[PDB]
């Protein structure tokens, strides 16, 4: 993202969350010094061979959305996750109109 000088996946890789030491929606292991991005890369990678185009989209949407939530409903932690998580959501969203599916977009 303009000014976010990085591979925003790496950006995410710079997001650890101590309080939440337990996380798992569609295989989303996260712990104390365990970066949001470490699990983001985890997903991205094996989710490529698992999911298809739009199911990849949807899986990111829903999983990283569970992240969106459980950090959002976790007022004790800070939410640096959700901005770039949502930025990821946008690269997802933008990636294609026709490929992206309205069910995923709905959700």
């Amino acid at each position: 993202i303009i000014g976010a000088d990085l591979s925003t996946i790496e950006i995410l890789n710079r997001l650890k969350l101590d309080y939440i030491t337990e996380f798992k929606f569609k295989n989303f292991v996260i712990a104390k010094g365990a970066p949001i991005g470490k699990s983001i890369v985890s997903l991205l990678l094996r989710c490529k061979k698992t999911l298809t185009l739009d199911r990849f989209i949807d899986t990111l949407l829903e999983d990283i959305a569970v992240l969106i939530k459980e950090i959002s409903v976790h007022p004790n932690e800070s939410k640096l996750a959700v901005p770039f998580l949502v930025a990821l959501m946008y690269q997802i969203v933008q990636f294609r109109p026709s490929a992206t599916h309205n069910l995923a977009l709905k959700d």
Binding site: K16, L17, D18, Y19, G33, P75, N76, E77, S78, K79, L80
Partner: protein, 851 residues
């Protein structure tokens, strides 16, 4: 009140208050309450003298106690102790933030952590510290608390100055202003504020950084240093705000550092160093002093050799100043500042030590006369040194006076009026030897020098006074006889070279000088007329018993009002005056068979304080000297202890809801507990039984009065004032408590003490009774939830600091006060100054006095 002294019908409530105010987050309240005889587990209880008389070790205790940080109560109390007496180094090394990862996200209203950490490293920090650690300490979720908003923007100002941005810095500092001014500040009815003093001193340091960033160049910034020295000349009395203010300045000069700003950083460290020293905190003082140690500071290591000249290494301190002084006569090394400072201190050192005969020390006096020629603190300190030498040659034999010392005093009185660097302050140092040689003159009416020498000093007195000897109290107790030809001459020649003299109204050994001064070319009216007028009035009405108009209602006299209303004073501030525009009159015609009273009426139209005394008290005046020494010591916390000044120039001469204080003290007396039978059990009856008697007193009752009066500012500031003048009371062993000990005004501030009319009166007094300060049986409850060991304890520690580096000079002064006319114990407790609490002390000391 309506339950016993210590139990759970008193503890549970205290503990929930603890929890709630810890949530709030006031550090000094924290200290007081966590101390108050908490009887839990050893760590949580130990804070009994948490900072007073041992602080650093209990501080590292709290430190590794919160090392797991999983008792966040214990870790905000960590950072508590770190604040309360300044271990900001382990603040910046408290490895929750200064690590690979920092914050545990949203330090919640547990944010006492954040607030303290922030102020601490904002004063001892840098781009590394402030940058990365606001980068950890801002980022939180629940807006619930704002301490960290304040300090985060002060630190963002600092990072901006490091980013070289006048505009950005100004904006950030001004926003810090906004926040603290809006939600940190408190009201009036209360303006005994000193709690709020911490926050407004934060505001002051922010203003400092703001114009330090608008500082155009080195010349504008030199003006800036001058205006901050003027701050240092008229701001207040405490170590702690010196610390925050100039340490924040230090962060400034460090974050924004060029070559000119490296000299800036050096000089700020030197300032904070020597000030933090001079206010007995040779710990963090020493730390930042060594920070400037890395920067070419000979004099400064002489001040460190001085603190060890207090602690343990007189010999080596003296040696190093010897060779360093006589070896650093090279490049720079200003001879009348570097050389003269070091060898000056070498001279006072050897005066004190007398381990190496004063022979070479009179020779190093000659050596400063040589290397020093622009500077004069050597001259005044050698006036006092040769005062010690007139004493020594009076011990050598019947030669008390001296030509070298007389000439020293002579050029000092050639230099009196210029600035008054230590003149009014050291006035004791001169009156002592003047009256010692006056006593010599009356004795030996060998000792063939009192005549010429005494007359030379009297000519000194006359030459200064005539077109200006104002400091005569407990030696000119009363003027009733000649055989000196100077006593009355001066005590009544000040009365015309000082322009209260219109409202007065041995037996043959007094007149000659009186009519001599009548002979003198200045004679408005003959005062002894009215003096013996009222004398015969009294001695006719002294015996008219049963089983005022004679000299009363007359005024327009030539002598001063007999009633004690004369001399509220000024002090070194730089043209300096020994009293606003006023004309004493109205001779009291009340037959009080004696209160005659007026007040302040100046030109502007305000009213200034008043209090009535009598009968030859000057130990009061040395307490005003002590307050002015606190001022020059400062020259966070900042105890608000106001001060009057009852000086004199003859006998009997010189100066919360509080209406609630008055009536509640009335109800304590008027609970109808008999006011003269408790004294029967005390004195007239069993003493070892009077011990449990004073306990049944404390449990028969006062303190309700005190806290009902108090709320936060009232309690906190009265406690601070009581801390400071209570430690002064004990340190000066004065005691002898009074009957309306505290009576102040009701609007904005004024919180202080009264009595102080005594000096070693509790140990060196007819039938000594418990030498201490003014203490009550339920003094703990006088402070309430924090106890008389609380913020009292904290500002008591600040009193130790605020009067234990000028302490050698203060002890030298009190050496004079001894005055057994109306030594061993004197020097002994001078050394002592050098080196609950009614729940315990009451029974122990008070009863083992009356048990």
């Amino acid at each position: 009140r309506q339950n016993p002294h210590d139990k759970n019908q008193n503890g549970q409530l205290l503990k929930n208050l603890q929890i709630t105010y810890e949530e709030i987050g006031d550090i000094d309240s924290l200290d007081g309450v966590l101390r108050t005889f908490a009887t839990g587990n050893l760590v949580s209880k130990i804070e009994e003298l948490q900072y007073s008389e041992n602080w650093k070790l209990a501080q590292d205790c709290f430190n590794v106690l919160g090392k797991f940080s999983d008792d966040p109560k214990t870790t905000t109390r960590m950072l508590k102790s770190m604040y309360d007496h300044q271990l900001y180094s382990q603040i910046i090394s408290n490895s929750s933030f200064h690590s690979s990862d920092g914050k545990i996200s949203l330090s919640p209203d547990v944010k006492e952590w954040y607030s303290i950490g922030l102020e601490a490293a904002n004063l001892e920090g840098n781009v590394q510290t402030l940058k990365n650690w606001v980068e950890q300490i801002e980022s939180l979720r629940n807006i619930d608390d704002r301490e960290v908003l304040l300090q985060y923007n002060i630190a963002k100002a600092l990072i901006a100055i490091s980013n070289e941005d006048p505009l950005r810095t100004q904006k950030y500092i001004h926003n810090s202003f906004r926040l603290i001014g809006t939600n940190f500040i408190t009201s009036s009815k209360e303006t005994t504020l000193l709690k709020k003093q911490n926050l407004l001193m934060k505001l002051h340091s922010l203003y400092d950084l703001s114009f330090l960033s608008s500082a155009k160049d080195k010349f504008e910034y030199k003006s800036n240093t001058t205006i901050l020295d003027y701050r240092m000349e008229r701001i207040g009395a405490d170590f702690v705000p010196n610390h925050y203010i100039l340490s924040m300045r230090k962060s400034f000069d460090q974050l924004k550092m060029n070559e000119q700003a490296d000299a800036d950083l050096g000089k700020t460290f030197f300032t904070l160093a020597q000030l933090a020293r001079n206010n007995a905190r040779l710990d963090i003082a020493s730390e930042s002093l060594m920070h400037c140690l890395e920067r070419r500071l000979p004099q400064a290591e002489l001040e460190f050799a001085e603190i060890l000249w207090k602690q343990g290494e007189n010999d080596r301190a003296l040696k190093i100043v010897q060779e360093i002084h006589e070896k650093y006569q090279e490049n720079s090394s200003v001879n009348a500042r570097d050389r003269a400072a070091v060898l000056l201190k070498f001279t006072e050192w050897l005066d004190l030590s007398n381990n190496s005969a004063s022979e070479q020390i009179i020779k190093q006096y000659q050596d400063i006369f040589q290397i020093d020629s622009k500077w004069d603190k050597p001259y005044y300190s050698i006036g006092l040194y040769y005062s010690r030498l007139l004493e020594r040659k009076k011990a050598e034999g019947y030669i008390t006076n001296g030509r070298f010392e007389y000439r020293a005093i002579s050029y000092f009185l050639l230099a009196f009026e210029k600035n008054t660097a230590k003149v009014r302050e050291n006035l004791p140092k001169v009156i002592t030897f003047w009256l010692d040689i006056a006593a010599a003159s009356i004795s030996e009416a060998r000792k063939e020098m009192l005549s010429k020498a005494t007359e030379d000093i009297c000519s000194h007195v006359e030459e200064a006074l005539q077109h200006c000897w104002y400091f005569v109290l407990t030696q000119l107790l009363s003027r009733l006889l000649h055989s000196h030809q100077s006593s009355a001459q001066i005590i009544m020649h000040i009365l015309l070279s000082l322009a209260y003299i219109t409202a007065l109204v041995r037996v043959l050994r007094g007149k000659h000088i009186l009519e001599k001064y009548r002979q003198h070319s200045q004679n408005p009216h003959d005062l002894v007329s009215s003096a013996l007028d009222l004398t015969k009035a009294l001695t006719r009405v002294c015996l008219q018993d049963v089983k005022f108009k004679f000299d009363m209602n007359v005024a327009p006299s030539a002598m001063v009002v007999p009633v004690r209303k004369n001399l509220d004073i000024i002090s070194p501030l730089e043209g300096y005056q020994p009293r606003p525009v006023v004309s004493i009159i109205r001779f009291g015609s009340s037959y009080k068979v004696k209160p005659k009273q007026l007040n302040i009426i100046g030109s502007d139209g305000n009213i200034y304080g008043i209090m009535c005394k009598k009968e030859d008290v000057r130990q009061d005046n040395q307490y005003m000297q002590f307050a002015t020494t606190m001022d020059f010591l400062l020259s966070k916390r900042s105890l608000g202890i106001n001060i009057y000044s009852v000086l004199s120039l003859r006998e009997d001469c010189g100066i919360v809801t509080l209406r609630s204080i008055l009536s509640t003290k009335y109800e304590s007396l008027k609970i109808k507990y008999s006011l003269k039978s408790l004294h029967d059990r005390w004195q007239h009856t069993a003493v070892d039984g009077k011990l449990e008697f004073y306990m049944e007193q404390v449990d028969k009752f006062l303190y309700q009065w005190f806290l009902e009066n108090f709320w936060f500012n009232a309690r906190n500031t009265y406690a601070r004032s009581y801390a400071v003048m209570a430690m002064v009371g004990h340190i000066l062993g004065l005691g002898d408590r009074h009957c309306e000990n505290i009576l102040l005004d009701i609007q904005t501030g004024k919180v202080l003490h009264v009595d102080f009319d005594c000096l070693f009166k509790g140990k060196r007094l007819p039938v000594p009774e418990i030498v201490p300060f003014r203490l009550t049986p339920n003094l703990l409850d006088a402070l309430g939830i924090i106890g008389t060991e609380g913020t009292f304890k904290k500002s008591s520690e600040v009193t130790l600091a605020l009067m234990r580096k000028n302490e050698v000079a203060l002890m030298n002064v009190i050496e004079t006060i001894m005055y057994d006319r109306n030594q061993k114990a004197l020097k002994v407790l001078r050394n002592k100054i050098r080196g609950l609490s009614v729940a315990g002390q009451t029974e122990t000391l008070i009863q083992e006095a009356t048990s």
